Symmetry: D2
Subunit: 289 residues, 4 copies
C-alpha cells in the first residue's frame, strides 16, 4: 500500500496532474491538496466528470484518487489564519486546510504516508520585474513558493515512515536569468533549490527521508498562462521545442514519470538534488543557427 | 572624485570596514550607512577615537570618511516605518534613515555616486535550524538580507552615473549545506545570489551599471560571533585555515581589495557573478588527511 | 525485447555489475564488454561457477547474460591496433575487440540494441598527483576514460533504435578537488561530464537518442582498491557513511537502479545531465564533527 | 620589479596581447612565448614596426617587452622532441623552445619570476563536431590546450617566488554547449577549468602560489577567425552584443585588466576560480528577442 499527498492542483492542466497520473500507473493512492479558492469548482468539475478523459491511464486502469482536500500552503497552523480568510466566501464553508491540519486530517483518516509532492508556486507581483517588486510582493512570493515546502516538511515528517521521499518543482530561472519571470519568483525558486539541500541534510540524518527538486521545462498550465508577460509561456515553449536537444513536446506525464521514480525506493541514493526534466534545454548556451 | 556608499557597518571588526579601508587606499570618498541601534554608540566610539588605530592605511594616509549616516535596510520609504520604530529609544532622535531617504540625503549633500556596497545580513532565527524556522523568521531573514539589496538598487540607481558598480556579500552555504547557518540565512544568500544575476540583466541593459556578489571566507566579526551555534565561527575559521588551499589568515582587507576592484572600472566586463574570496576553500571536496 | 551493452567490467565487484543486476529485474538482455587482458580469466570464473551466487536476481530468476565479449576502449578500429598488441600474450588469441569491431559483432549476432553503458575508466598514473602526471599518463587517462565514450557513441549509434539511451559513470572529483584522485582521472571525469552535454545535443537533435552520466559515491570495487593511495577508498567510504545526508551503505545496485531508470522511456525528458547518486554527499560543505 | 611570462601569442590581435598591455600599465616586464612556426614571422613584424602603434600604453609609455621567445606547449623537455621536428623548416633554426627549456632559459637570463599566463589553445579538428572528432584530434586538443598548463606549472614553479600568480583563459563551452566549438576544445576547456582547482590545491598548499582561469567572451582574434565554422566568431560577437547584460564592445584589455588583477597581491585570497569576463553573457538563459 502506497500513499502520496500532492499539494497544489486546481485542474488537470498542471504538473500536479501529470505527477498524479504516473503514480497511479504504479498503484499508489493519491490524496489531493487543493487551494480553497479553486476547490469547490474542482469538486463540481469532478462530480460532473470533466476529468474522466484526463483520468485515463491508458492500460484500462482508472486513475485512483483516494481523497480530495482543501489546503492552503500559506497557513501553518490554525492561529495563523487571519480574520479576513475566516470570513471569506471561498473559505467559510471549509475546515482543516492549514498545513498542520491537513497533516493531522490525513494521518487520522489513513495513517502514515511515504510520498510528498510540492507542486505550487505563487507570486502576487510576477508581472512586475525584480527591480520593481515591492517588499510585500517578494516576501509573499517567498512565503508561498519557498517557505511552504519547509513547513510541509516539518509537519508531514511526523506522518511519514522512514525511507519516505519528497519532491518540489522548480525552474531554471533561479540559475539563469529569464526576463518576465518576476515578482521574486526566481528568488523563490533559488531559495527553494537551496532549502532542498539543507533540508536533505536534516531529513536524511534524522528521518532517513529523502527530498529532491525537479527543474521542469515549460508547460502550458493555467498558472503559466497567468504569467501573462501571445505570452511568456507560448514563447518559452516554442524556444524549447526548437532549441532543446530533445525536440519533442514536453508533457505533464514526462515530469510525473520522473517524480514517480524519485518518490520510489529506486532513487534511494539521490537526495538534495535539482533534477532537470526539460528535454535538456538547460545544457545549451547558444541557439544553433 | 569617487564616492562609495557602504551599507552595514557597526564597528571595525566587519567586512564593511575592510571594504572601507581598501577603497580609501584608492582615494575614494566613503559614506557610512549605520543601523540605528548601533549608531550613537558608533559616533561615541568615533569621536573618542577608538577607531584611530583601525583607520590606519599604513602608507601615511588616514582613512577618509566623508560622512556617517543612520540607515535601516528594512524600510524602503518613510510610510514603511511602523509606529513602534517611530517611538523607539534608538530611532527617536534620528531622521532620513530609510533607503529612499538616505538615497535622497546623499544625493542632495554630494550629488551622484558611482559605487555601492551591501554589507549586511540579518536573520532573527539563525540559531534554530531551517526545519525549525517559523514563517515570520524566514521572511524576516529574506527581507533584511536579500530584499534590501533589490530596494537599495531601485533607489540608489537614480543617484548613480552610468558605469557605476554594486557589490553584496554572500556565503557558500547557499550552494552547499553548512549546519548551524540557520533561520533562513542560507535561503537568503541563495536568493541574494540569484537576484545578483537578474538585477545584473536589468541594471546592465538599462543603466550600464554592474552588480556582483562576493562569497567570503569566515571572519570573526561581531555578527559571526552572534551565530553562536567556542562557536560556529571559531570552528569555520580553524577548518578554513587548515583545509584551504591558501593556508593564510583571511583578513577583512582581503575582501576589500577584491571589493575595490569590482567597484572600479577594472572589472568593467564582470557582472552577475558570485566571486569566491575565501582562500579557495570552496574548491575542496574532502579534507586532506 | 531489450538489449543492453555494458562496456567496462572484469568482475562482480564493480558498478557495471550492479547496473547489470538491476537491468535483469526488467528482463533486458545484457551483453558484457570485457577488457581483453582479463577476459579469459573472467570466462574461467564464469565457467567455474564463481559468479553464480552473484547472479541471482532474488525473485527466482537468473541474471540473463546474452553474451560476454572482449572489448578494448582504447582502440577504435582494426587499424588502430599497434604491433606489440599483435604480439601480446593476452590479446593474441583474441579478435574483434575494438569498438567498431564489437559494435559490428553485436549488430551481426543480435541486430539493433537500445541501451548503452560506459562503465570503464583508467588513469595509468592515478597515484601521482596532477602536478606530477606526465603527458603520456594524462593523455592515456583521457583516451581511456573520456574519448572512449564518444567513440562508443560514434560506433554504437549505428546499431541503435530511435529513443535509445546511454549512460556513463563519473566522480565528483571533477567539480571539487579530491586529493589522491590523480593521474588526470579528475581531468578525465571533467571532460566526460562536459562531453555528455555536447553529445546530448548531437545525439539528441540527430538521432533522438539521450545520454546522461551517473556521478556515484565511493564503492569498494576492484579498481577503487587498485587506486591504492588505509586506502584512498577506505577513507572515502568511511567519510561518506559518517557525513552523507543518508546513513546507509551505498550499493552498486543503488546506482544500478538509477541507471536502469535513466536507460528507460521513463526518463525520455532527461538528457545531458550529471545525476548524483552518492547518498547526497555532494551537497555537503563542511562536516559537523 | 615584476616579471610576467605570457605563453601563447602570435600577434596583437589576441588576448595575450590585451593581457600584456594591461600589465605594462603596472610596470611589469613581459616575456612572450611564441609558438615556433610563427616566431620568425613575428620578429619580422616586430622589427618592421608593425606593432609599434599597438604597443602604446596611452600615457606616454611604450610597452616594455623584456624578451620574446620561441615556445611550444606540446613538448615538455628536450627528449620530448620527435624527429620530423628535428627536420621541420620552421623549427630547424630554433632551439630551447620546449617548456622546461624556456623555463630554464628565462630563469638563466632573468632569475625568479612571479606571474604566469597560459594563453594558448589548439584543437586540430575544431571544425568537426565532438561526435566526429578522432582520437588523434581529441587527444591533441587536450595535450595542446589542457596538459600544457600543468606542464607550465610543473616547470615554472621552480623559477617563481612565493605568493606568485597564474592564469589561463577558458570558454563557457565547457559548461554549456556551443554548437561549432568542436574538436574537443570544449572537452579541453572543461579539463582546464577542473585542473585549475586541483592545481590550486597542490600549488597552494605546497608553494603558497595561486592559480585561476579567466573565462572570456568572444573576441575576433586570429584563432577565433581560424575557427572558420558568417563565421562562428562573427555570430558569437553579434549575439553577445545584442544579448549580454552589458551593451558595450568587449576588449582584450577588458580581459587584460582582469588578468592584471588576478595576477597581483590584490587577490591573494582568490584561487581555483573560474572568473567570467564576458559582459555577463553567461548568466543569461533565453534571449528576449
Ligand atoms: N508550468 C510550467 O511550465 C512550469 C515550469 C517550471 C516549474 N513549474 C512549477 O510547477 C509547479 C506547479 O505549477 P503548474 O505550472 O503545474 O501550474 P498550477 O496551476 O498547477 O500551479 C499552481 C497550483 O497550485 C495551487 N496553489 C497555489 N497557491 C496555493 C496555496 N497557497 N496552497 C495550496 N495550493 C496552491 C493552485 O490552485 C494551482 O493548482 C510550481 O511550483 C511551478 O513553479 C511550472
Ligand atoms: N563574517 C563572516 O565570516 C562572513 C562570511 C561570509 C559572509 N558574510 C557576510 O558579510 C556581510 C557583513 O557581515 P559581517 O560578518 O561583516 O558582520 P557585521 O556585524 O558587519 O554585519 C552586520 C552589519 O550590518 C548592520 N546591519 C544589520 N542590519 C541592518 C539593517 N537592517 N540596516 C542597516 N544595517 C544593518 C549591522 O549593524 C552590522 O554592522 C553580511 O552580508 C554577511 O552575510 C560574513
Ligand atoms: N567505485 C567507485 O568508488 C566509483 C566512484 C565513482 C565513479 N566510479 C566510476 O565507475 C566506473 C566503473 O568502475 P568501478 O569503480 O566499478 O571499477 P571496476 O574495476 O568494476 O570497473 C572498471 C573497469 O574499467 C575497465 N577498463 C579499463 N580500461 C578498459 C578498456 N580499455 N576497455 C574495456 N574496459 C576497460 C577495467 O578493466 C575495469 O573492469 C568507472 O568509470 C569509475 O571511474 C567508481
Ligand atoms: N577570442 C576568443 O573569442 C576567446 C574566447 C574565449 C577563450 N579564448 C581563449 O583565449 C586564449 C587566447 O587565444 P586567442 O583567442 O586570443 O587567439 P590567439 O591566436 O591570439 O592566441 C592563441 C595562441 O595559441 C597559440 N598556440 C597554439 N599551440 C601552441 C603551442 N604549442 N605553443 C605555444 N603557443 C601555441 C597559437 O599560436 C596562438 O598564438 C585561448 O586559450 C582561447 O582558447 C578566446
Ligand atoms: C501570480 N503568478 C503565479 O501565481 C504563478 C506563476 C508561475 C507559476 O509557475 C510557473 C509556470 C511556468 C513556468 Cl515557465 C515556471 C513556473 O514557476 C506558478 Cl505555479 C504560479
Ligand atoms: C541574528 N544573526 C545575524 O544577524 C547575522 C548572522 C550572520 C551574519 O553574517 C555572517 C557571518 C558569518 C558567516 Cl560564516 C556568514 C554570514 O553570512 C550576519 Cl551579517 C548577521
Ligand atoms: C590505475 N587506476 C585505475 O585504473 C582506476 C582508478 C579509479 C577508477 O574508478 C574509480 C574508483 C573509485 C572512485 Cl572514488 C572513483 C573512480 O573513478 C577506475 Cl575504474 C580505475
Ligand atoms: C584550429 N582551431 C584553433 O586552433 C583554435 C580555436 C579556438 C581558439 O580559441 C578560442 C577562440 C574563440 C572562442 Cl569563442 C573560444 C576559444 O577558445 C584557439 Cl586559441 C584556437
Amino acid at each position: 500500500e502506497d500513499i502520496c499527498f500532492i499539494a497544489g492542483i486546481g485542474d488537470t492542466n498542471g504538473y500536479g496532474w501529470g505527477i498524479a497520473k504516473e503514480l497511479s500507473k504504479r498503484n499508489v493512492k493519491i490524496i489531493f491538496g487543493i487551494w480553497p479558492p479553486v476547490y469547490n469548482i474542482f469538486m463540481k468539475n469532478y462530480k460532473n466528470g470533466k476529468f474522466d478523459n484526463d483520468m485515463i491511464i491508458d492500460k484500462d486502469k482508472k486513475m485512483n484518487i483516494l481523497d480530495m482536500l482543501p489546503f492552503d500552503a500559506s497557513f501553518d497552523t490554525a492561529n495563523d489564519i487571519d480574520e479576513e480568510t475566516k470570513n471569506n466566501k471561498r473559505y467559510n464553508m471549509l475546515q482543516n486546510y492549514t498545513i498542520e491540519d491537513v497533516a493531522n486530517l490525513i494521518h487520522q483518516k489513513y495513517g502514515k504516508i511515504n510520498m510528498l509532492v510540492h507542486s505550487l508556486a505563487n507570486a502576487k507581483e510576477v508581472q512586475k520585474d525584480l527591480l520593481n517588486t515591492s517588499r510585500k510582493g517578494y516576501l509573499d512570493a517567498l512565503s508561498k513558493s519557498s517557505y511552504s515546502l519547509i513547513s510541509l516538511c516539518k509537519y508531514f515528517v511526523n506522518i511519514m515512515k522512514p525511507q519516505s521521499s519528497i519532491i518540489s518543482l522548480t525552474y531554471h530561472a533561479s540559475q539563469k536569468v529569464v526576463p518576465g519571470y518576476g515578482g521574486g519568483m526566481s528568488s523563490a525558486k533559488a531559495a527553494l533549490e537551496s532549502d532542498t539541500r539543507v533540508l536533505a541534510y536534516h531529513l536524511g540524518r534524522n528521518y532517513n527521508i529523502r527530498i529532491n527538486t525537479i527543474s521542469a521545462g515549460p508547460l502550458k498550465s493555467r498558472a503559466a498562462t497567468a504569467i501573462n508577460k501571445y505570452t511568456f509561456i507560448d514563447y518559452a515553449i516554442e524556444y524549447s521545442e526548437k532549441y532543446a536537444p530533445l525536440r519533442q513536446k514536453l508533457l505533464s506525464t514526462d515530469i510525473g514519470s520522473v517524480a514517480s521514480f524519485l518518490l520510489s525506493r529506486e532513487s534511494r541514493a539521490i537526495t538534495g538534488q535539482t533534477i532537470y526534466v526539460d528535454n535538456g534545454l538547460n545544457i545549451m548556451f547558444l541557439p544553433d543557427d
